[PDB]
Structure 1
């Protein structure tokens, strides 16, 4: 439900591991997609993320009982300092033609 801090950082790493993070709307499945090994019950991605979206650092979408949350480019600087990771500009963008 609420108040993990050692178990809220878990999603943040995925959110910057790739500039997107898909989800679902069902709240009862602890089988969270994309390596949920840190005991995330599919919440905290539709509880804390509505905070992240409402600030302007990530962007939201809905498609058939789903969410397609996008990390904005200018949210990288915000989510580089709270994560206090090295100064880097590569969430998922090699910035070359693939």
Structure 2
């Protein structure tokens, strides 16, 4: 399998809760840190975000061994579909910035 559905949903919900993801480029470390740390190897995080990026949905940067992934509007919509949320909820980022 590419990963368990349990693992996928755990990664997607975290990305949606915050709105931005980070992982070091390393396939060996046994657990991702952060709120995936009880469960998921960061190989799954990298491999998951790669698919998500190839479908729009995400912007990707990489600087000194560390990916930085932003969620774009299409990503907000797709994740709001895929997770069956109140069709207008976003705790990701909501405040007018002075």
TM category (shorter chain) comes to 0.7 to 0.9
**How much has 1:52 moved relative to structure 2?**
0.4
Q: State the distance in 2 between where 1:35 and 1:58 align.
A: 20
Extract structure 1 runs of 4+ deviating beyond 3 A.
Answer: none
Q: Which has the higher helix share?
A: 2
- Unaligned ranges ≥5, structure 1: none
Bigger shift: residues 85-94 or 75-84: 85-94
Q: 1:6 to 1:46 in 2, by over 3 A?
A: same
Deviation at 1:49, TM superposition (A): 1.2
Contiguous gaps of at least 5 residues in structure 2: none
In angstroms, what is the RMSD of aligned CA positions?
1.8
Following the alignment from structure 1 to structure 2, what is the Cα–Cα distance between the partners of residues 15 and 24? 16
1:52–1:58 contact (8 Å) kept in structure 2: yes
Deviations 1:51-94 (A, max 9, x none): 10010001111010110011112321111001111112424212
TM value normalised by structure 2: 0.87
Bigger mean CA deviation after superposition, 82-91 or 21-30? 82-91
Tell me if the contact between 2:26 and 2:43 (Cα under 8 Å) persists in the aligned partners. no
Distance 1:3 1:11 in 2: 11
Aligned residue-pair number: 98
Deviation at 1:3, TM superposition (A): 3.2
**In structure 2, do the counterparts of structure 1 residues 33 and 88 end up closer, same or farther at CA, with 3 Å as the change threshold?**
farther
SS at match of 1:68: strand
